[PDB]
A paper describes a structure:
Abundant filamentous inclusions of [name] are characteristic of more than 20 neurodegenerative diseases that are collectively termed tauopathies. Six [name] isoforms that range from 352 to 441 amino acids in length are expressed in adult human brain from a single gene by alternative mRNA splicing. [name] filaments consist of a structured core made mostly of the repeat domain, with less structured N- and C-terminal regions forming the fuzzy coat.
We found that reducing the shaking speed from 700 to 200 rpm was important for the formation of filaments with the AD fold by [name] (297–391). For [name] (297–394), besides structures similar to those formed by [name] (297–391) at 700 rpm, we observed an additional filament with pseudo-21 helical screw symmetry that comprised four protofilaments (filament type 34).
Residue numbers in the entry:
A (entry chain A), B (entry chain C), C (entry chain B), D (entry chain E), E (entry chain F), F (entry chain D), ...: 304 to 378
Write the structure that this text describes.
């Protein structure tokens, strides 16, 4: 008498992660038409101002891919 | 007498995550038509201001992919 | 006498996650037509102001994919 | 006697033209769920056919911008 | 006696043309789920066919911008 | 007696033309999930077929910008 | 007993095909009698015109002859 | 007993194909009598014109002859 | 007993193909009688023209003759 | 005193003669289809006969062109 | 005193004669299709016959061109 | 005193004659398709015949061109 065994599992799967700011930004202040223009700014004590500025702030403690796998046969 | 065994599970799945700011932004203040223009700013004491500014703030814990799998055969 | 066994489950599934801000933004204050214009800002004490301004705050815990699976045969 | 003349017409206009195909289309045939599917096509003699398709062709004669202007002063 | 003349017409205009294929199309045939799928095709004599397809062709005469201007002063 | 003349027409304009194929197409045939798939194509005599395809062709006469201008002063 | 067999089908045919442009055309513009003639032609901008012309273009994939024949005797 | 067989099918045929441009054209512009003649042509910008011309082009993807024949005797 | 077989199929046919441009054209522009003649032609910018011309081009993918024949005798 | 003479008559005429039988001849008796052919003719004594025959008889005196002309100047 | 003479008549005319039969002949009797052929003719005494024949008979005196001219100047 | 003479008549004319038979002949009797062939003719005493024959007979006196010209100047 006799025995015959074949053992061969297969993994062909695929996995993706994408994280953070993935978009697009278009910013354009003051693109007008004017004949005569005049601007006068006067700032004194502990003043703060932002005029036509852009701040992009991104951080990502996230995001890993992880796998644990175990195979065994005994006879 | 005889015995015959074949063991082969298969994984062909696919997995995706996308996280955070995924949109698109268009910003354009003050793009007019004017003959005569005048702007006068006078700021004195502990003043804060924003004029035409863009702030994008993004953060992302998590957003990962995790798999655990275990196989055995015994005879 | 004899025995004959075949063992092969299969996974062909797919999974998707999309999380956060997904829209599109269009913002455009002050794009008019005027002959004569004058603007006059006068701030003394502890003023906070925003004339036209855009900010996007996005944050996203979780949003991930998790799978656990186990197979055994005993004969 | 004396004379003083000042001559200054001004143009501050804007002009735009957009021509052709600008719209939005969504088309998605046959995207179902079924256990067993079979298809059996047999086309013999001078046959014309279309299955799940879209046609886009564009001609633009027109759509330009034109201006003519004249200025005269005689003393 | 005396005379003084000042002559200064001004142009501040802007002009734009966009012509042809600018829109949005989404097309996605056959994107289903099935266990068993079979297809037999048999095309014999003077056969023309389209399956799952999209056609894009563009011609643009015109779309241009043109300006003519004349200035005269005679004393 | 005396005369003084000042002559200074000014042009500050801007002009744009864009012509042809600029829009968005998304095309994706056959993107499904299946366990068993078979296809059997049998074509004979004067057969023309398109399966899953996309065609792109562009011709542009015109789209140009043209300006003519003349100035004359006579004393 | 006895048998005698004679087998002789006969074909004496003729077959003809003529395809495309076979007809008769007479064209003869401007063939007159005149004492004095003068012609002034002045074309500026994006003009198309025709005077006294003839167009001949021919496509023929078709028009062939085909025959299939089979003979069998079994004793 | 006895047998005699005679087997002699006969083909005496003829077959013809003629394809494309076979017809008759007569063309004769301008053929007059005149004492004084003058022609003045002034063509400036993006003009196309035809005067007294003839165009001849031919494509023939087929027009062929084909025959298939089979003979069998079995005793 | 006895048997006698005679086997002799015969082919005496004829086959012809002619493809392309075979017909008759007569062309004769301008063929008059005149005492005084003048022609003045003045062409500037991106102009195309034809005067009294003839164009001839031919392509032939088809037009062949094909025969297949088989004979079998078994005793 | 003085005398000034110029003498120049001009001939630009054209003349044509065409005379007789103006065609081309096509003749084809007996081109039929028949299974079995037999025809019976019995002529004894001084018979004359014509069957399917063509006689073309043409003759042309004259038909020519003649011109006679004379010039003189005397002083 | 003085005398000035110029003498120059001119002939630019043209003359044509065509007479008789100049055409083309096609003759083809008896080109039919027949299985079995026989014809029976019995002619005995001083018989004349024509069957399917072509006679073309042409003759042409004259048809020529003649010109006579004379010039003189006497002083 | 003085005299000035110039004497120069000019001939640029042209003359054509065509007379007789100049053509092309195609003759082809008896080119048929037949399985079995026979013809029976019995002619005895002073018989004449022609069957499918071609006779072409041409003769042409004249057809020529003649010119006579004479010039003189006397002083």
């Amino acid at each position: 008498g006799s025995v015959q065994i074949v053992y061969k599992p297969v993994d062909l799967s695929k996995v993706t992660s994408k994280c953070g700011s993935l978009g697009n930004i278009h910013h354009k202040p003051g693109g007008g038409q004017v004949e005569v223009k005049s601007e006068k700014l006067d700032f004194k004590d502990r003043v703060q101002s932002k005029i036509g500025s852009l701040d992009n702030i991104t951080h990502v403690p996230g995001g890993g891919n992880k796998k644990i796998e175990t195979h065994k046969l005994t006879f």
